[PDB]
Design a protein around this ligand. Structure first.
Ligand SMILES: CC(=O)N[C@H]1[C@H](O[C@H]2[C@H](O)[C@@H](O)[C@H](O[C@@H]3[C@@H](NC(C)=O)[C@H](O[C@H]4[C@H](O)[C@@H](O)[C@H](O[C@@H]5[C@@H](NC(C)=O)[C@H](O[C@H]6[C@H](O)[C@@H](O)[C@H](O)O[C@@H]6C(=O)O)O[C@H](CO)[C@@H]5OS(=O)(=O)O)O[C@@H]4C(=O)O)O[C@H](CO)[C@@H]3OS(=O)(=O)O)O[C@@H]2C(=O)O)O[C@H](CO)[C@H](OS(=O)(=O)O)[C@@H]1O
Length: 213
């Protein structure tokens, strides 16, 4: 079927990570943002800077994993709102403040590696799923429209994290609907349609996860 969590209110506006390699932190908050609305009914901007600064399990603006993000939130007994811990585009010391807490997490759940059907089901039943992809290519950077496909995409080269907010079909072409963190001027108002069931293009289902809540 077709699912688009943007239309269910499950998705906040597109943010801009800037030069910082904090894509993992935006992906993570995005899956969290969606699960919080699922549980509470309210939609709130969560705080990537919290993750960047405080997930020692990761490398800040030098990269990191989504899972360690989810794991931090659980162990930490929460994550701040954007407003209480605003993004500033650079690593700093952890300034997590329990008074600013907006969301919680019971750990995470991992999609079986490279299984796009498994990713489909999880997106439908759960909500927005955090994924990692090959976003190195010139075609990705200059994406504007359509179902993104590049014959040179490397599934074993996961360099960028994003959020699968849905899936669909355009003109017979199956896709994943993907929220990125390069601002509303990149791509299609910050989003990209990426090829679905085309042999796990760009490693779309290689590193997919969502937080339990
Ligand atoms: C009362 C009513 O309204 N009836 C309608 C009628 O209906 C619809 C119904 O409304 C829909 O909800 C339904 O939706 C599909 C959904 N299928 C079903 C039946 O719900 C499909 O789902 C998944 C399912 O969730 C999952 O459990 C199943 O998985 C098991 C599988 N698991 C994994 C991890 O793979 C398991 O794995 C095996 C491996 O496969 C092996 O390789 C390995 O060796 O072993 C493992 C293992 O054992 O562990 O295997 C199991 C069994 O072997 C399961 O697999 S199974 O599915 O083959 O059984 O996988 C399902 C899948 O297909 O992936 O998801 C779909 C979309 O994601 C649909 O969901 S939905 O669209 O969101 O709803 O479909 C029903 C239907 O169409 O029949 O519809 C009628 C007419 O169409 C009437 O409607 S109408 O007349 O009113 O229009 C009627 O009213």
């Amino acid at each position: 079927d077709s699912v688009d969590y943007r239309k269910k209110g499950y998705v906040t506006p597109v943010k801009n990570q800037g030069q910082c390699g904090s894509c993992w932190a935006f992906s993570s908050v995005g899956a969290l943002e969606g699960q919080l609305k699922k549980k509470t009914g309210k939609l709130l901007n969560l705080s990537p800077q919290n993750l960047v600064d405080c997930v020692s399990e990761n490398d800040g603006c030098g990269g990191g994993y989504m899972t360690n993000a989810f794991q931090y939130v659980q162990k930490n007994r929460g994550i701040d709102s954007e407003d209480a811990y605003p993004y500033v585009g650079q690593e700093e010391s952890c300034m997590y403040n329990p008074t600013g807490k907006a969301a919680k997490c019971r750990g995470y759940r991992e999609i079986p590696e490279g299984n796009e059907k498994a990713l489909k089901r999880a997106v439908a039943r759960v909500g927005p799923v955090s994924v990692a992809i090959d976003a190195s290519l010139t075609s990705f950077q200059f994406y504007s429209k359509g179902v993104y496909y590049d014959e040179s995409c490397n599934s074993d080269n996961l360099n960028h994290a994003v959020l699968a907010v849905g899936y669909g079909i355009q003109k017979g072409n199956k896709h994943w609907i993907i929220k990125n963190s390069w601002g509303e001027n990149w791509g299609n108002k910050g989003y990209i349609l990426m090829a679905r069931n085309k042999n796990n293009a760009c490693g779309i289902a290689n590193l997919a996860s969502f937080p339990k809540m």
